[PDB]
């Protein structure tokens, strides 16, 4: 699941207005940070030492999203679905 992970934190970062990051390499860093065990707020914590121009509030809704993904992903659920999801919002 680590390769549609990054697709679809590469969605829901696409969708941010005003994000000036380079979406593949912050969308990296988060399935790093997550796939290796950390905590929700230990993630959001790790992004906002690196990322200044991105709030906590929104670092935490794509931290949210991402790992409400993971596991929507293990139980079954298609990435089309989960990204046409992140999409339409």
């Known amino acids: 699941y ?6 679809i934190v590469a969605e ?5 207005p005003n994000f000036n990051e380079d979406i593949k390499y912050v969308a990296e860093y ?3 940070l997550i796939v ?3 905590t929700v707020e230990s993630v959001v914590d790790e992004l906002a030492s690196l990322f200044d121009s991105v709030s906590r509030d929104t670092l935490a809704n794509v ?9 929507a992903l293990q139980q079954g659920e ?3 679905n989960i990204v ?3 999409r339409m919002m």
């Open 78 to 80: 298609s990435a089309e």
């Open 36 to 38: 290796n065990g950390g």
């Open 30 to 32: 988060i399935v790093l």
């Open 63 to 71: 931290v949210q999203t991402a790992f409400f993904a993971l596991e």
């Open 84 to 86: 046409s999801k992140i």
């Open 12 to 16: 829901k970062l696409a969708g941010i």
């Open 2 to 7: 680590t390769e549609n992970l990054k697709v």
